[PDB]
Amino acid sequence: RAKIPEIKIASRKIPNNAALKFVKDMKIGWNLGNTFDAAFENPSFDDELLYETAWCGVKTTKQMIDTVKKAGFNTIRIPVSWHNHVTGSNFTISKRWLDRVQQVVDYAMKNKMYVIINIHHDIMPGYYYPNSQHLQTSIKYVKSIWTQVATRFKNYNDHLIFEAVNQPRLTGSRFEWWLDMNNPECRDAVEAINKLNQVFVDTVRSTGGNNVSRYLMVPGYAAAPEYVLIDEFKIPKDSSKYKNRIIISVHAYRPYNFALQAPNESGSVSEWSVNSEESRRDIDYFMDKLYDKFVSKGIPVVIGEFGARDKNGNLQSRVEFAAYYVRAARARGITCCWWDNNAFYGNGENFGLLDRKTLKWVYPEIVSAMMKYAR
Numbered sequence: 001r002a003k004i005p006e007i008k009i010a011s012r013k014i015p016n017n018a019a020l021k022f023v024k025d026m027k028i029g030w031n032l033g034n035t036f037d038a039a040f041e042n043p044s045f046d047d048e049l050l051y052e053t054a055w056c057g058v059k060t061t062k063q064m065i066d067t068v069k070k071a072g073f074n075t076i077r078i079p080v081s082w083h084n085h086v087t088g089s090n091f092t093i094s095k096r097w098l099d100r101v102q103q104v105v106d107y108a109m110k111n112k113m114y115v116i117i118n119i120h121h122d123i124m125p126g127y128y129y130p131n132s133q134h135l136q137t138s139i140k141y142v143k144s145i146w147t148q149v150a151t152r153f154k155n156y157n158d159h160l161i162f163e164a165v166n167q168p169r170l171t172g173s174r175f176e177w178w179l180d181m182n183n184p185e186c187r188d189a190v191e192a193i194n195k196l197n198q199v200f201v202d203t204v205r206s207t208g209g210n211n212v213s214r215y216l217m218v219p220g221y222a223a224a225p226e227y228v229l230i231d232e233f234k235i236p237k238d239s240s241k242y243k244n245r246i247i248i249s250v251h252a253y254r255p256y257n258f259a260l261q262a263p264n265e266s267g268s269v270s271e272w273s274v275n276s277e278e279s280r281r282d283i284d285y286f287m288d289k290l291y292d293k294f295v296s297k298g299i300p301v302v303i304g305e306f307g308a309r310d311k312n313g314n315l316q317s318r319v320e321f322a323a324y325y326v327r328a329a330r331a332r333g334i335t336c337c338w339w340d341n342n343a344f345y346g347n348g349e350n351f352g353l354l355d356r357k358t359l360k361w362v363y364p365e366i367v368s369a370m371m372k373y374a375r
């Protein structure tokens with residue numbers, strides 16, 4: 001139904017070290033989106049495990065993960081929102097919830113896949129919130145969640161990756177998605193994120209076993225490329241006797257007006273062309289800056305989320321986008337993970353690729369476009 005383009009992007013020099021070989025072997029990722037990350041108050045149901053299906057509508061199965069592996073993905077990102085699953089002053093995670101998350105991790109481990117688990121939609125005062133006012137509780141939350149999760153998974157091999165937090169930011173604010181680094185409120189949030197990323201690393205390493213050397217992903221503000229590129233971002237100090245085990249996490253649905261902006265919002269575009277510098281510009285730019293600051297210096301970078309939402313059937317554009325984005329990243333030593341939220345029609349964000357109920361690929365052309373350039 002679509003024509004996959006022949007993409008010509010020269011490879012950059014990629015330092016030969018273990019971390020960048022690891023990221024290369026991850027190859028390309030698929031997010032189990034809108035699954036364990038679903039989060040909201042006042043559930044109509046009694047069984048907390050129904051959060052798994054409240055948004056995506058389909059319970060995860062081993063056959064589903066098998067299907068994702070068979071299509072060529074070698075990484076599964078399993079975002080998890082924990083705040084609807086904790087009780088008590090020290091955020092005890094419900095055993096049934098953590099048990100179910102572990103069952104799904106096991107589906108992926110059986111397929112010899114890389115697996116990323118995180119803290120996702122927990123960005124609220126009283127849980128994870130990056131400012132001085134709420135920092136003491138945020139430290140307690142990061143410490144408690146990651147002590148519990150890291151302990152459960154301590155004897156999992158290095159294919160399992162921990163990601164500190166998804167998109168740490170101030171919410172319901174002009175600064176939620178953009179910083180003015182001359183403003184003290186923004187400087188404070190960047191500092192809080194540095195502190196909480198250090199707490200995360202220290203907490204994980206302290207639990208022993210394979211957690212002493214496992215790869216760990218950390219974002220900057222809002223997981224934006226810009227806010228790991230600022231001078232104020234700090235890679236946490238790592239006590240691992242293995243060097244270079246911290247991976248920079250970024251999310252980049254770029255160009256925004258094509259990939260993520262809703263099609264009924266003024267400014268949205270539905271066309272993307274491999275022959276247009278206007279389509280390519282924003283992809284090249286942030287990847288170039290990340291290559292300059294991190295990859296070229298040997299520091300690994302993973303794009304944990306990208307994608308392009310369907311806009312009234314714009315398949316050819318999304319096919320060209322996906323091929324270009326994956327090749328641009330691979331040429332710079334970076335591996336990417338598509339956000340697959342099992343959403344295909346309606347007014348929502350229609351990022352789905354796999355129809356989970358049938359295990360059929362709705363957009364195999366997009367998958368094939370990525371696989372052509374992922375290795």
Ligand SMILES: OC[C@H]1O[C@@H](O[C@H]2[C@H](O)[C@@H](O)[C@H](O[C@H]3[C@H](O)[C@@H](O)[C@H](O[C@H]4[C@H](O)[C@@H](O)[C@H](O)O[C@@H]4CO)O[C@@H]3CO)O[C@@H]2CO)[C@H](O)[C@@H](O)[C@@H]1O
Pocket residue numbers: 033034037054055056121166167177222251252253260305339341343348349351
């Ligand atoms: O229909 C069920 C439920 O959907 C809720 O909306 C979901 C979207 O369906 C889902 O695609 C979205 O996924 C996020 C992901 O969790 C984030 O890590 C990241 O967030 C975006 C952010 O949404 C943008 O506003 C911002 O500009 O960019 C970041 C990425 O840089 O990316 C994806 C895609 O947006 O999560 C939503 C929930 O937060 C509806 O809210 C709910 O009403 C529906 O019931």
